[PDB]
Amino acid sequence: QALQQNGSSVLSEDKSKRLNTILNTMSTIYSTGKVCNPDNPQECLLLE
Amino acid sequence: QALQQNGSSVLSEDKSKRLNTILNTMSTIYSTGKVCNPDNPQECLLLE
Numbered sequence: 001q002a003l004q005q006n007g008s009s010v011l012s013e014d015k016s017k018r019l020n021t022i023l024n025t026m027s028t029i030y031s032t033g034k035v036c037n038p039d040n041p042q043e044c045l046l047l048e
Numbered sequence: 049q050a051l052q053q054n055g056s057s058v059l060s061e062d063k064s065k066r067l068n069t070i071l072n073t074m075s076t077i078y079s080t081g082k083v084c085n086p087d088n089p090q091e092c093l094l095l096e
């Protein structure tokens with residue numbers, strides 16, 4: 001049973017590629033998104 | 049005549065520091081300004 005689950009295999013190739021791309025985009029936006037001061041737009045901070 | 053030049057010494061002290069702050073802010077804005085497109089806001093380019 002632990003070896004039986006299909007996972008993402010049953011998903012179509014184009015749909016699988018789309019899902020992987022969307023997950024990577026999500027992770028990249030979360031990791032490298034920054035906001036900026038309203039009175040000094042040349043000073044912008046990451047999250048962590 | 050070259051040596052007798054007065055320069056900005058004739059200006060008031062508070063106005064002198066105000067002018068120096070303005071010049072420094074101008075230089076910093078020009079040097080560190082950056083822009084980026086709405087397609088991928090996580091890639092912003094300097095000028096040079």
Ligand SMILES: *[C@@H]1O[C@H](CO)[C@@H](O[C@@H]2O[C@H](CO)[C@@H](O)[C@H](O)[C@H]2NC(C)=O)[C@H](O)[C@H]1NC(C)=O
Binds near residue numbers: 004005006010
């Ligand atoms: C994982 O996906 C494959 C699909 O290829 C499943 O295989 C099917 O199994 C059913 C049930 O016996 C058959 O009716 C189909 O003919 C099979 N399709 C094939 C071989 O292409 C497999 O069962 C899935 N694993 C699960 C649900 O645990």
